[PDB]
């Protein structure tokens, strides 16, 4: 009936996408929606800090860091006197539906407010408000929270709006700084945010393959000073021309004593005498522009939040909207606030594995993976099989492939295999471009764009004899492929060729890597976040144009092949007005309908348009056709420009999502390989390791055939199609 | 003969573009060229720190911060014992020509070494070297320096390699931060580099329209504490949701006492009680990737340096290569090293106007312009004319237009005019979209992409009657136009329409703004540095992807109209293999010849290609044609991809060059307007204010007609065409 | 366009399952022969399919048709008669004109007079006789 939305706490990139999603979805469901300026402060002050919102108020906001409606820290809201005055102002305007976008504290605050919402009974016991209105507006205080925080603090949620973006800032800094660690082989201690949370520290570290990291959840344990210094001297012996050490603000040892970045420098300058600087990043990390992931994430939960509020009844407890396993869920607000404090309590009580376990499994996966690729046991202590495992790149280049290779190699070596790097995909395979590869060979790869080993789309079918010859020559006991649809096709071909060539009767696993995200058996592929970010950046600049000129509509063609992932998701994140794709037919009625919408849109103040066309979405309805239609039908009203982005959409260095995705899923694949070799051939030894809903699973290529449209190289059931109605709503 | 190049001192972005330019140009003139690794240290150590360089060695270097060959600080080089050993190693390889890329100290070192050369006579008096070789390799030690430094320290030079890039890092941080300041209404004190130089502080401040700045050249003078605090409270009264204060590392008051950023925070937290943070940026500012300006700059001086060396004779004194007024000059090395110390001596001796005067006029122009737009005299003290001056945007959107508008408005108001903002170019003019605009209305624009007032290409010719009606209605005493060729054409039309419409008999001035840089009467236009960076940014990401297979050529189409500025300069900065432009005809022989070159290039290790096509460089030879030719003729060898960059080249946020160029030239134009109105119509009152070689000048539109190719809307004589031989040399 | 496409669709429920669409080469900037080909192709998808042809420079001809030979012959002779008659009376608008067929009979019209009857920007006249026949095509189809 009336919805109020506010933004409390340390601001986060994506907060604006969320407010936009709540205001638009609220209005779309036919509700009125009120801004509450300056977080809880606006609610305490009242009056004009509360103001109705229309469609136009949330445009030009999406692509912008921080909150276009303010975040106040609000002391007053920690006091009964403040909360009475807040509740009063809400009742003044009939607001009893509340959407609160903030962090641990903001949500602890809203949980407390909700419980206390019979502060109304105080209001009546004074003049405050009418007696009968203590019952009209009673405990139908309907609270829903979304966690907007760069820290990944909150317990319920797998992810928080801001984190991906903050990690972008950190890695932009880290990548920038690595070129100045050559002006002397400098050691840089970088101090990142996460006051009582190590997530942002951990992820950064993993993403830039950092030499050491410090988290409060998981302290170093006694004697690390020497072990770290061994690492950094070993690194000068490996000839590494720098060192990078990532330190959470709230890092501690096993006694809860601060490990400060200035402390670390003194240790390194003292023991080793390396030239050493310390950068305190600070509020950069809250700033800049919201990544495509946060824009989309925030947009999905702005919408679920509005549904959760209207679906709520006086029975339903206050909840927190979350994406767990790429599905939007509601979680009871009380319990999540509780669980988060519990994590502080675990650290406070020197119970560190408990803090880590309570953080979620995700946290522990990052931590475990990081250690494995950062600390190398001496050859003496890693005994193990005389197995030789190969690593190859197949498909077109995808950002993150390199990270992936480095991970596979180190985990294999760590598991005591011997790692063979195969060059140029199945081309180099057929021609025997194979060489042994070690731990140091893959150092500094975690953020390299493209493919250093080299990648080709060519399939193995016509080189089975030659390829089988190479496996025999090099005694290849297993194979890991990092690639796109061509890899998948490659496994099918080799699976079928087993009965003629013994050499292919080994465990073969693939992890998916392409900008296109068209690989069957995985909801995500290494490289697509990078691409979405370049698309998102580009559309932002485009709309800025459309906006200066006014009355202009841009038609923009994107990649994907027949896979409308980049187009669709790119559309959402850029706040386009339409994104045509192959998996959703559209006729000239659909086009005329969008054209008529845009026409009406040019009677408002937002006189711009953004239309995205998947490059292979329609035989006849080409980018030109669409450009010609809209140009012509808008004739009294707007004009158009077509742009074909083409292969620059790939982007450059992989985005952190792709680096870590590359790193994490590849290591998980190698684990599978060693476990299999350890029990020493059927369908179960040739599979795709991919992300399916909640968890990662290995799916035999046999099974994926029936789930695959071979003729357009896209899967048959694609998860992101369920999101199609958002674009149109949120526009 | 033989040339050696080294990189000493605090490293700077663009140092690599310079080494590449020296190696390629050295070889091109048929010299041998040696790397000297690790600055002066490599020269002292000898052996393999000196290594001959071939063509291939300097590829993949251009787009990378810092030095691919090291910078050592070198104590040994401060001692006769070190310099003897250095001189010895040079003679061992016949190196007697030296190119030194560094700063104050590096260059002071090379000047000393030069004077002392015939430390050789010591070499003979020992075993060191043959007696007769003390005369073959004698005082034909030929030294040439280039200044690679982010600080703009050195005196001779107008600009130093690294500054533009560093200012990019700073503004990237400052832009990122503004977002979290809005959110909480925070005051941010940012501490930037410039140990004993205020340039990087000053330019930043101007580029992000900072609320206060602190330079060591120009201290605050007594009573600033209160004056600053008045400013920041006035800013909350204006409802500005943040404050940004830029503090040079080496800021001081009039007594040479440190003004620390932690000191500023205490003053603001104390007197006003605003929420306040401090960011120390640190070595981020030396990092990241070299801007297009530094790439081009460094490339032009790498080349001049090689010429300077071979043209030198034992008479000619060691020099420092510089761009002053966009023309490469040689400056005696001794005198420039002297002058720079003089500036420290001036500050040390509390002689502050002398430090500013010795910094150059450029420095004092930035400082003066900054103050004018940052400090607003109370209405009481700004009396002045009852004149109404209009500001309009004409042409397609260009990054920096907004900065320009803000500057015009404030300088006009400061000059006691009444400022009218005209919306949507001559469209809105004809339709009377005119409104008064004030000081606060333009706050926060300095870094806004696109055009907030709005721009249209439509010309006034068919709306003279209507437009004249608007000037009469609003009593428009003068006009400032920020725009491209359409503005220029617009002034010609209105100039001609004077005799029929009295209303156009006012002073009209235009400042040039377009990504294209095709405006006659100016070597530069507001928006083109942004576009060059977008082009440069994009090629970098392209080269970053596809990595191991290579044998790929990218054909990339750029804007400009018929103006090959973006294409040509973009080509240089991106290190392209060709950039086809309209001002230099090419036939199918030319194309076949480039294709056959690239073919030979794929027999080397650098198997990539980059071809840029100005979008209107040829009717028949389209981007597709070129893509089809190269694709086909490389068939055994390489393959291709075409990309049409399109409307992103306008930009996201304007680059600092464009912001400051926008700000400075617009203010200068408004000055002209007020001076003209003060003497109160012929050709001299309708002109283009533009940058011509060394200095800015107003040129009547009458005079520019003969200097204009009207049919292709480019000027006739274009300064950057003299640079055409570089691309091919440096490739 | 959509209305013609829907007509042809219904037409393919009768026995005359063919279609013929003609496009004047400059009839629309945006609605090109390809656009129309793409629309009809796509919207007929369950029903009919398409082929585009651009006739081009054959439309000039091989040998002229008899109408054109005789028209060429008859009007040119008539123009020469005019020339000799004029030269025989031996300068204003009436000596520079277009000899052309207007309704029933041929007439000489000064170029001065034809300017106001001319769309210069698309090089067609303003009032064109055959446009009165436009309803026939649809009727007779
Ligand atoms: N009892 C409570 N506990 C915590 N926060 C509360 C609260 N009651 C109100 N709040 C609000 O939360 C603000 C505290 O800062 P805060 O902890 O909320 O940041 P945040 O949630 O956005 C990021 P993080 O959760 O990582 O701290 C206060 O200004 C106050 O208005
Ligand atoms: N008088 C001198 N004689 C010999 N070497 C000298 C010298 N002055 C400077 N150098 C060289 O340069 C270094 C010392 O000053 P430095 O080069 O570091 O300043 P700089 O030129 O890099 C940057 P800035 O612009 O801030 O002064 C030493 O490594 C030394 O090799």
Coordinates of N, CA, C and O and ligand atoms in Angstrom, one line a residue, chain B residues 8-10 40-41 72-79 83 102-110 112-113 147-149 151 153-154 195-196 286, ligand 2:
Chain B
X8 N 67.0 6.4 -15.3 CA 67.3 6.7 -13.9 C 66.2 7.4 -13.2 O 65.4 8.1 -13.7
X9 N 66.1 7.1 -11.9 CA 65.2 7.9 -11.0 C 63.8 7.5 -10.9 O 63.3 6.6 -11.5
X10 N 63.1 8.2 -10.0 CA 61.7 7.9 -9.7 C 61.0 7.7 -11.0 O 60.9 8.7 -11.8
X40 N 71.9 4.2 -13.6 CA 73.3 4.3 -13.6 C 74.0 3.1 -13.1 O 75.2 2.8 -13.4
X41 N 73.4 2.4 -12.2 CA 73.9 1.1 -11.6 C 74.3 0.2 -12.7 O 75.4 -0.4 -12.6
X72 N 67.6 2.2 -11.0 CA 68.3 2.1 -9.7 C 68.6 3.5 -9.3 O 69.0 4.4 -10.1
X73 N 68.4 3.8 -8.0 CA 69.2 4.9 -7.4 C 70.7 4.3 -7.3 O 70.8 3.1 -7.2
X74 N 71.7 5.1 -7.6 CA 73.1 4.6 -7.7 C 74.0 5.5 -7.0 O 74.5 6.5 -7.5
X75 N 74.4 5.1 -5.8 CA 75.4 5.8 -4.9 C 76.8 5.8 -5.6 O 77.4 6.8 -5.6
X76 N 77.2 4.6 -6.1 CA 78.5 4.5 -6.8 C 78.7 5.6 -7.8 O 79.8 6.2 -7.8
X77 N 77.7 5.9 -8.6 CA 77.8 7.0 -9.6 C 78.0 8.4 -9.0 O 78.3 9.3 -9.8
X78 N 78.0 8.6 -7.7 CA 78.3 9.8 -7.1 C 79.8 9.9 -6.8 O 80.2 10.9 -6.1
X79 N 80.6 8.9 -7.2 CA 82.0 8.8 -6.8 C 82.8 8.7 -8.0 O 82.5 7.9 -8.9
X83 N 82.3 6.4 -11.6 CA 82.2 7.0 -12.9 C 83.3 6.5 -13.8 O 83.1 6.5 -15.0
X102 N 65.1 10.6 -17.1 CA 65.1 10.7 -15.6 C 64.6 12.1 -15.1 O 63.8 12.7 -15.8
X103 N 65.2 12.5 -14.0 CA 64.7 13.8 -13.4 C 65.8 14.7 -13.0 O 66.9 14.6 -13.5
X104 N 65.5 15.7 -12.2 CA 66.5 16.6 -11.7 C 67.9 16.0 -11.4 O 68.9 16.4 -12.0
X105 N 67.9 14.9 -10.6 CA 69.2 14.4 -10.2 C 69.9 13.5 -11.2 O 71.1 13.7 -11.4
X106 N 69.1 12.7 -11.9 CA 69.6 11.9 -13.0 C 70.3 12.8 -14.0 O 71.4 12.5 -14.4
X107 N 69.7 13.9 -14.3 CA 70.2 14.9 -15.3 C 71.4 15.7 -14.8 O 72.3 16.0 -15.5
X108 N 71.3 16.0 -13.5 CA 72.5 16.7 -12.8 C 73.7 15.7 -12.9 O 74.8 16.1 -13.2
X109 N 73.4 14.4 -12.7 CA 74.4 13.4 -12.8 C 75.1 13.3 -14.2 O 76.3 13.1 -14.3
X110 N 74.2 13.3 -15.2 CA 74.7 13.2 -16.6 C 75.5 14.4 -17.0 O 76.5 14.3 -17.8
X112 N 77.3 16.2 -15.0 CA 78.6 16.1 -14.3 C 79.5 15.1 -15.0 O 80.7 15.4 -15.3
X113 N 78.9 13.9 -15.3 CA 79.7 12.9 -16.1 C 80.3 13.4 -17.4 O 81.4 13.2 -17.7
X147 N 63.2 14.4 -19.7 CA 62.7 14.4 -18.3 C 61.5 13.5 -18.2 O 60.4 13.8 -18.7
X148 N 61.7 12.4 -17.5 CA 60.6 11.5 -17.2 C 60.2 11.6 -15.7 O 60.9 11.0 -14.8
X149 N 59.2 12.4 -15.4 CA 58.8 12.7 -14.0 C 57.3 13.1 -13.9 O 56.9 14.1 -14.6
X151 N 56.0 14.9 -11.6 CA 55.9 16.1 -10.8 C 55.8 17.4 -11.6 O 55.5 18.5 -11.0
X153 N 58.5 18.8 -12.3 CA 59.7 19.5 -11.7 C 60.5 20.4 -12.6 O 60.6 21.6 -12.3
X154 N 61.1 19.8 -13.7 CA 62.1 20.5 -14.5 C 61.7 21.8 -15.1 O 60.5 22.0 -15.4
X195 N 56.7 16.5 -4.1 CA 57.5 16.7 -2.9 C 57.8 18.2 -2.7 O 57.5 18.8 -1.7
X196 N 58.5 18.8 -3.7 CA 58.8 20.2 -3.7 C 58.2 20.9 -4.9 O 58.6 22.0 -5.3
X286 N 52.3 6.9 -9.4 CA 53.4 6.5 -10.3 C 53.0 5.3 -11.2 O 53.8 4.9 -12.2
Ligands
LIG2 N1 75.7 14.7 -8.9 C1 75.4 13.5 -9.3 N2 76.4 12.8 -9.7 C2 76.2 11.5 -10.0 N3 75.0 10.8 -10.0 C3 74.0 11.6 -9.6 C4 74.1 12.9 -9.2 N4 72.9 13.4 -8.9 C5 72.1 12.4 -9.2 N5 72.7 11.3 -9.6 C6 72.1 10.0 -9.8 O1 70.7 10.1 -9.7 C7 70.3 9.5 -8.4 C8 70.0 10.6 -7.3 O2 69.0 11.6 -7.5 P1 67.8 11.1 -8.3 O3 68.2 10.6 -9.7 O4 67.3 9.9 -7.5 O5 66.6 12.2 -8.5 P2 65.6 12.1 -9.8 O6 66.4 12.7 -10.9 O7 65.4 10.6 -10.1 C9 63.9 12.6 -9.4 P3 63.7 14.3 -8.8 O8 63.1 15.1 -10.0 O9 62.6 14.2 -7.8 O10 65.0 14.9 -8.3 C10 71.4 8.5 -8.0 O11 70.9 7.2 -8.3 C11 72.6 8.9 -8.9 O12 73.0 7.7 -9.6

